[PDB]
Amino acid sequence: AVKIRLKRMGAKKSPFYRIVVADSRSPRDGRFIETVGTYNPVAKPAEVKIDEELALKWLQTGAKPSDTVRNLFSSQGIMEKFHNAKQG
Amino acid sequence: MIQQETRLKVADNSGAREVLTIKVLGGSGRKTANIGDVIVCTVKQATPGGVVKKGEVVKAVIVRTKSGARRSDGSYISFDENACVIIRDDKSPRGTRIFGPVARELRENNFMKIVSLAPEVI
Amino acid sequence: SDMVYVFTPKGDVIELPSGSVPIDFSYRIHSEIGNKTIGAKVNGKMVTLDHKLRTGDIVEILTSKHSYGPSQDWVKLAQTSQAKHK
Amino acid sequence: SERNQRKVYQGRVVSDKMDKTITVVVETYKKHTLYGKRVKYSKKFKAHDENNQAKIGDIVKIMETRPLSATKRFRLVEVVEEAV
Amino acid sequence: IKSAIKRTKTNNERRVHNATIKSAMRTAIKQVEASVANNEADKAKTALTEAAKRIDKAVKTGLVHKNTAARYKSRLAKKVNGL
RNA sequence: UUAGGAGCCAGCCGCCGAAGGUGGGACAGAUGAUUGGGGUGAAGUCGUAACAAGGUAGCCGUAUCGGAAGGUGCGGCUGG
RNA sequence: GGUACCUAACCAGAAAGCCACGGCUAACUACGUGCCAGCAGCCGCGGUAAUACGUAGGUGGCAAGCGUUGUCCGGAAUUA
RNA sequence: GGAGAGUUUGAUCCUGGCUCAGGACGAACGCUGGCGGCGUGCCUAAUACAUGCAAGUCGAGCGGACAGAUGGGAGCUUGCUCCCUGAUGUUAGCGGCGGACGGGUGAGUAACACGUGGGUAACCUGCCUGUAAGACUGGGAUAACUCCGGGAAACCGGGGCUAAUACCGGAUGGUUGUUUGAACCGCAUGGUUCAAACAUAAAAGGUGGCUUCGGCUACCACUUACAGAUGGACCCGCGGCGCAUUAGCUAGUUGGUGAGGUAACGGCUCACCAAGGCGACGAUGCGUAGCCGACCUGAGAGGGUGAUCGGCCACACUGGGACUGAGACACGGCCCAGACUCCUACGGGAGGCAGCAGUAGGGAAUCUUCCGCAAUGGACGAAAGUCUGACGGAGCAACGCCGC
C-alpha cells in the first residue's frame, strides 16, 4: 500500500511532478511523510533531480514504487545500489 | 350507524385530524348513515400543516365504521373506528393518500379513485 | 420569418410565432398543458426553459398529471406576446 | 531505554470526602494574549489516594496514568506538606 | 445494485454459519460454568478443554479476536483454580 | 454402526429499544378588534413655560392639582 | 491536437467605451429650464441669467472595461 | 515602516458625531466589449429529481456451460450434415480481495470535534518488507447445472448431480491462558527476560519447467511468530464567541466495591454501598456557527472572513439497529419504520444525484447532459490487461488578476 510515487503539480498544460513517499489511501494530491526531489517532463532535455540516498533507507523498510517512478532510480542507480545491499 | 353530532377520525393527510357531522344527505330527515353515504361535515381539529384547517364546512364520504354492512352473502363488515375521507364535493376525493383499510362497499357507487388509492380494500 | 414551425410528440407541424420557449409550446395544444408542465425534451436531450425553439423541432413535454403549478418566474418566460397574453 | 515521563504537578487539596481520592488545586498562572498582566486561574483534578492519607489543605504531588474512573486521571506521588 | 448483490447473497449465508460457531462457543462456556454451580472439578477440567476447543478455533475462523478470548480463558481458568 | 448424544436452527419468550399516540408546563414568531405613549411632516387652533431680574430668579428629587406647557407646597443648589 | 507553435502571403483594413466636470476632487462653458421637472455620499443645489438639474460642445478620469449596489477591513487615536 | 479633507458657528478654538478619498470580493446589476495565457465559478434549499454513466477485478481459486476444429471417422445432395476434445476463446454462478479509499456537501455539533504540545505499563493494524518456522491426515456439503412447483412481476419453493486456494475434523507447532519457579527494572497499576508443567491453536494449493513418474524445482498464494514500516482508537495540559435582561445546575449524576462488557481504560452497563460532583476564573442554559494551515486588511498591535487548493472530524432522503470484513455502524450494501415518488392483475414490490453532467425549484446569481484512461493515480491479477465522471483535457460566462 505504501507506494513511493509522483505527485501532480504545476499549471494546466505543462505539468510538474514531485516524487513522494506516502500512503496510497490518501488521494493523488494527498498528504505524505517525506519527499525526495523533483521530476520534469516538459523539458525536452534532462533535469530529473533525486535525493538519491534517502529513499534507500525507505526501501530497506520496504516501499514498492510504480515502474514509471522506479526507472528514474535505475537511471541514477538507486535500485542497483539497493540491490547490492540486498546482495550484501 | 353515524348520526348527527358524532365525531369522526379522518383518514387522509389532507389537513384534518377529527371531524364532526351536520346532516346525512338522504331525504328530509335521515337518522343514521352506514357506509358510502355522503355527509356535510365540519372540522373540529386539523393538522398544523393544513390545506383544510379548523372550522370549515366540508362535504365528505364515510369509509369505515363500527356499523355492519350486510352484503348479500351474509358477511358483515365491521371496523373498529368511525371514519371519513374528505372529498371535493363530487365523486372524487381531495386528499393525497388514504390511511388504513377501506370497505369494499364503496365500489357500489363510482368512487373508484378512493378505491384506486386504497391500501387494503377490505 | 416571424414564426416557428415546431413539432408535437405526434409529429404535427405546430405553427407558433418565432422566439418561443417550450412554455409557449404548451398553450397551442391546451392551456392545462401549461398548468401541468414541468420540463421539456427536444431530440433526446432535455432542454432548459431558457431555451428558445427553432423552426422544425420535435418538442416533448415533461407533464405532471394534475399535481404541480406555476410560479412568478414564468411571467417573463413568455416571449411571444399572444401566448404571453395567455 | 527509559520510557517517556508522564504529566506531573504539585498542588493543594480542598476536600477529602471522596472515597480513596481527592481534588488538588494547581495554581500555575500566566499572562493574557492581549494586555500583558498575569492573573491566576483555578485548575483542579481528581487524584487517586491508595493510602487515604489526605488532609484538607495538603501540599501534595499528583501523577497521571490511564483513567481510573470517571474524571479520575491522577494518582499521588508524595504527601509533601500537611495542614495544621 | 452495482452488481454487489453477490455480497448480500453470501453475507446472509455467512451470518448463519458464523453464529453457529458463536452460539456453540457460548454454550461451551456456560457448561463449564454449570460445573461451577455444580461441585465437580474433574467434570470442569474436561469441559475446559471442551470449551477452549471451540474458543481457540473461534479466532482461527473469524471475529472473536484473541484479546477477548484471553479473558474467556482466564475467567474460566480461575474457577477451576477455585476448586 | 438399523440410532442416540453433542451441537445447530425454525419457533415462541424476556430486557433493552427508534418512530407513533397521550398529557401539562417552557420559550420563539406571525397575527388580534381597540388603546397607550414615542418621534415625523405644509404660516392649523389654544395659550407663553424657558432663555434678559423672561416680565413671579431659574433648576434638579418627592408630593399634589389642572385645557397644556406647568402651578405652588417642603428641602437643597449658584450654573442668581 | 495538426492544438500550441513556427514559416511565408494579405490589407489601415476587424475592433472603445462608460464615469466625472460648484467645494471634497483633476477638469466649464452655451442652450433648455423657473420650488416645477430633477441631482444628491458629504456640505447642500433650482421660485428667470443652474460652472450642482437635463442637453450640446469641450475637457478630465480610467480602460476591455467603467460606474452604481451590498459586504468586510482601513482612514476611525471614533473602545485608545 | 504611520498623509488627510467638507460640516455645528456671524466669527474662533475645542469637543463630538457622521460623511469622503484607499484596499479587496466565490460578488450581483447598468452600459459597452477584440484576443491570449493562468485561476475560480449554487453562499439561498443538507429542497425534490427525468436519463445516462460514477467499482469492480481473478479461467493461472473452481466446477460446468460456452464456442472451437488440430486432426480422426460417418452419411450423402458436392452441397453439406456431423461425432470425438485442437490451439484457444466467452465468463451467469461459485470462491478470493476490493467496495470503509478515491469524490462531494456544511446540516447538526461551543466539545478533547479541531489547533498545539503530550502520555499509554491501557490499545489495534489484512494488504509492506525483513527474519524465524512451516505447510501432515481425512471428512461432509452446495450453488451453478438441470427437474418440477408457486408467482402479474418482483421472483420464490421443492427433488437430485458437482467442484474448488469454499467449508469442517485429526496430528504437529516458540500464539495464548493456567500453575510453579527465577533474573532485572520502572512511575502505583507493575513491566521485561528465562525455565518447567498443563491446555488446545493451524496451513492450500495453483502456475511453468525438470523428472527415475517416486517426485523435484523456481514463482505465486497459504498458516504461525518476531520486529520494522503503516495508519487508527482512547486519554491530557494549553489555546480561538455572544449574552448575567441565563445563578443555580446534575441521581449513573458523582464516589467506592465486585460483576459483566468492550481491541483497549472506564458508571461504559448493572447490583450493592456512600453522598458527592459542577460554580463567580460564569457552571447550567440559550441564540449562534464546522475547525486549521491560511485569505483580506492594518504601518505594527489587532480586526473581519474560513470560499476554491491542502489537514481532520461529522453527514449520506429523516431516524434506529446490525451483520461480513484488518478496518464501518458503510455516499452509489442489507433489515426496520416516517414522509414522498414509481409500478402492480391491489396480492405485492422496486427507488434515494449534498458522484459527473443536466433539469425542476429556490433566489439578485453561478457553467458543458464532450472526449481520453496518453500522462499521473488507485482497484484487483503472475503479467498483458481490465476498470476508472479520481484525474486528464476540450466547452460556457469580461467573474477576477495579469498580457496584447
Side-chain angles (χ1 to χ4, degrees):
Chain A
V2 181
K3 287 185 179 179
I4 304 170
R5 64 187 181 182
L6 295 173
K7 191 256 187 65
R8 176 65 172 268
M9 294 299 290
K12 180 169 69 66
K13 292 299 293 295
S14 66
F16 184 78
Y17 294 95
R18 296 178 68 186
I19 305 172
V20 165
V21 180
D23 287 330
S24 64
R25 302 294 176 88
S26 68
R28 199 272 313 277
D29 297 333
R31 63 103 173 270
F32 62 97
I33 298 169
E34 188 177 2
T35 185
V36 293
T38 49
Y39 175 72
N40 285 111
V42 299
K44 181 173 68 67
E47 300 170 353
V48 181
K49 297 179 183 179
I50 305 169
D51 197 3
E52 195 173 2
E53 57 89 20
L54 192 147
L56 190 146
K57 180 258 291 182
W58 290 96
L59 290 175
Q60 291 179 356
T61 63
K64 295 179 181 179
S66 68
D67 290 331
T68 64
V69 180
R70 189 261 179 193
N71 55 8
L72 295 173
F73 299 98
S74 71
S75 65
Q76 298 295 321
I78 291 97
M79 294 293 290
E80 191 171 1
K81 185 63 65 67
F82 179 73
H83 189 75
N84 290 318
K86 296 285 102 176
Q87 290 179 356
Chain B
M1 301 301 290
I2 288 177
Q3 292 178 354
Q4 184 176 4
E5 291 290 327
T6 69
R7 296 179 184 178
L8 305 179
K9 188 181 179 184
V10 189
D12 57 353
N13 51 7
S14 65
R17 184 184 293 275
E18 182 174 358
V19 153
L20 185 144
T21 70
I22 300 173
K23 288 173 187 177
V24 180
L25 297 180
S28 72
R30 185 183 292 180
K31 309 291 105 178
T32 58
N34 282 315
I35 271 175
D37 295 329
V38 177
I39 311 172
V40 178
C41 297
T42 54
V43 180
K44 299 298 182 183
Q45 286 187 359
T47 57
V51 177
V52 172
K53 63 180 71 66
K54 174 71 167 67
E56 204 279 334
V57 175
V58 81
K59 186 167 184 173
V61 170
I62 291 175
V63 173
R64 65 265 184 103
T65 56
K66 296 175 185 177
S67 74
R70 187 261 180 195
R71 295 192 185 184
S72 63
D73 176 72
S75 68
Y76 294 100
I77 306 168
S78 65
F79 292 85
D80 290 326
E81 50 92 17
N82 286 315
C84 278
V85 168
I86 286 171
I87 66 168
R88 51 177 69 252
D89 68 3
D90 201 359
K91 294 175 73 67
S92 63
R94 76 175 72 183
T96 70
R97 287 188 292 111
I98 296 165
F99 293 103
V102 168
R104 287 180 65 87
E105 293 188 355
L106 290 178
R107 286 180 181 176
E108 195 275 333
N109 296 318
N110 293 319
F111 296 113
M112 297 303 292
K113 289 194 283 185
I114 289 171
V115 178
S116 68
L117 292 173
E120 191 180 2
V121 191
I122 302 172
Chain C
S1 179
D2 290 330
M3 288 182 285
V4 287
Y5 292 162
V6 297
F7 297 100
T8 200
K10 178 182 183 293
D12 294 332
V13 177
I14 300 300
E15 295 180 353
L16 290 175
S18 66
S20 297
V21 298
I23 298 171
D24 292 331
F25 182 77
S26 296
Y27 299 100
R28 181 67 177 171
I29 306 300
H30 195 273
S31 179
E32 292 178 355
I33 303 299
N35 274 309
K36 275 78 176 175
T37 299
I38 300 169
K41 290 180 181 178
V42 174
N43 293 318
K45 291 183 180 180
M46 288 182 69
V47 294
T48 320
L49 296 176
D50 295 332
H51 184 272
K52 288 183 180 179
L53 298 176
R54 295 177 292 173
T55 303
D57 295 332
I58 298 170
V59 182
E60 292 179 352
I61 309 168
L62 294 173
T63 309
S64 66
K65 294 179 181 179
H66 295 285
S67 65
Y68 294 145
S71 67
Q72 290 184 356
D73 282 332
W74 299 358
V75 305
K76 291 182 181 179
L77 293 174
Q79 192 271 333
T80 59
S81 179
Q82 296 295 321
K84 194 262 184 295
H85 188 74
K86 300 292 184 182
Chain D
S1 67
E2 180 66 30
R3 57 177 177 170
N4 291 319
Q5 188 177 2
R6 295 174 182 267
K7 184 68 72 176
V8 62
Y9 292 102
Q10 69 269 17
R12 183 174 58 84
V13 179
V14 175
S15 67
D16 295 331
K17 296 291 182 68
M18 287 71 74
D19 295 332
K20 299 185 293 294
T21 44
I22 49 174
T23 179
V24 171
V25 174
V26 178
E27 291 182 354
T28 64
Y29 59 105
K30 57 178 284 297
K31 58 98 176 179
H32 295 284
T33 65
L34 202 153
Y35 292 104
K37 194 257 171 63
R38 184 166 62 98
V39 199
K40 61 183 181 179
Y41 301 109
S42 62
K43 280 80 66 182
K44 60 184 180 181
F45 304 101
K46 304 294 191 291
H48 189 197
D49 310 334
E50 194 175 1
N51 292 319
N52 201 359
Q53 51 183 356
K55 290 184 179 182
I56 294 170
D58 185 77
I59 297 169
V60 70
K61 293 181 181 179
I62 59 171
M63 193 69 196
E64 72 93 16
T65 180
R66 55 98 178 267
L68 290 178
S69 73
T71 66
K72 293 188 180 181
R73 285 93 172 95
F74 286 98
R75 74 184 189 275
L76 295 182
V77 176
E78 291 293 328
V79 177
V80 177
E81 289 179 353
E82 295 177 354
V84 178
Chain E
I1 297 169
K2 196 66 71 177
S3 179
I5 307 167
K6 182 254 188 66
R7 296 297 303 165
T8 61
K9 191 176 178 181
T10 58
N11 197 1
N12 289 317
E13 290 180 353
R14 288 187 180 93
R15 193 264 302 276
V16 177
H17 183 273
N18 195 1
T20 56
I21 298 171
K22 290 183 181 180
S23 65
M25 184 177 177
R26 289 179 174 89
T27 60
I29 299 166
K30 180 64 184 294
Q31 189 175 2
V32 175
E33 291 180 353
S35 182
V36 177
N38 193 0
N39 292 318
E40 293 294 326
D42 55 354
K43 194 262 182 183
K45 290 181 184 293
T46 182
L48 186 144
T49 59
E50 185 177 1
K53 185 178 179 65
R54 296 290 91 194
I55 296 167
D56 297 330
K57 289 177 183 176
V59 189
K60 180 262 297 296
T61 57
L63 289 178
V64 172
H65 191 74
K66 288 181 181 179
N67 290 318
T68 61
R71 293 181 291 112
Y72 286 109
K73 284 182 178 180
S74 65
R75 177 257 185 89
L76 295 175
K78 299 293 183 180
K79 297 293 179 68
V80 179
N81 291 319
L83 294 176

